[PDB]
């Protein structure tokens, strides 16, 4: 099947939870660049192509979870505020 | 009247990048056209443009513009003027 996928649903007593754990955060990593990701480059997927590795994926960040934190409206309020992101050419 | 997503990214990059490479050109001829309608309003004043740069007369009012036109060929990857028609 896939790598470390059935291990994330057995470690915690829920499946629908793991979804947003690697959803509202994963899609947020791209719209925020890549700097917000402070963990080491160890927890990262591997893509075999041209004798090198690219992309990034996820499902390898879920380790230190918690109950109550932030609401749900600020997730994309101060995120797109600190970093605007765009696309320019020479 | 409503551009599709296909050319939506093309038309956007064809009207906001020329004024960047325009600075890299002879100050005199470039500043005449740029600092006239691009920063202000209305172009071609003749007896007023002669006192805007404080130099020549009303002859180069047509020459400078023409000399500049052929210089607009420079912006290849960047474009702005080629869209109005």
């Amino acid at each position: 099947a896939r790598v470390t996928v059935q291990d994330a649903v057995e470690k915690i007593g829920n499946r629908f939870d793991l979804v947003l754990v690697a959803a509202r955060r994963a899609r947020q990593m791209q719209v925020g660049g890549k700097d917000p990701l402070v963990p080491e480059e160890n927890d990262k997927t591997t893509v075999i192509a041209l004798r090198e590795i690219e992309e990034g994926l996820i499902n390898n960040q879920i380790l230190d979870v918690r109950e109550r934190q932030e609401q749900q409206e600020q997730e994309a309020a101060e995120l797109q505020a600190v970093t605007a992101i765009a696309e320019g050419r020479r | 009247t409503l551009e599709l997503p296909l050319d939506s990214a093309t038309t956007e990059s064809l009207r906001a990048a020329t004024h960047d490479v325009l600075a890299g050109l002879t100050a005199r001829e470039a500043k005449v056209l740029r600092m006239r309608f691009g920063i202000d309003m209305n172009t071609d004043h003749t007896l007023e443009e002669v006192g805007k740069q404080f130099d020549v007369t009303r002859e180069r009012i047509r020459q400078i513009e023409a000399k500049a036109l052929r210089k607009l060929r420079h912006p290849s990857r960047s474009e702005v003027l080629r869209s109005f028609l």
């Binding site: 629908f16 | 409503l2 997503p5």
Partner: protein, 50 residues
């Protein structure tokens, strides 16, 4: 047949299919409830808007 980009209407504003360009598979309602059963979210609102 396969379509990725094409023309769109005015008041309707939906994917069509001309001659040179292909046609887009209309996501029938029959495939909507089958998705709601899983209890998804974002993958349901996308097949309605953008």
């Amino acid at each position: 047949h396969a379509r990725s980009t094409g023309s769109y209407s005015l008041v309707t504003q939906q994917p069509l299919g001309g001659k040179a360009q292909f046609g887009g598979q209309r996501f029938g309602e029959m495939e909507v409830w089958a998705l709601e059963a899983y209890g998804a979210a974002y993958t349901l609102q996308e097949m309605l808007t953008v």
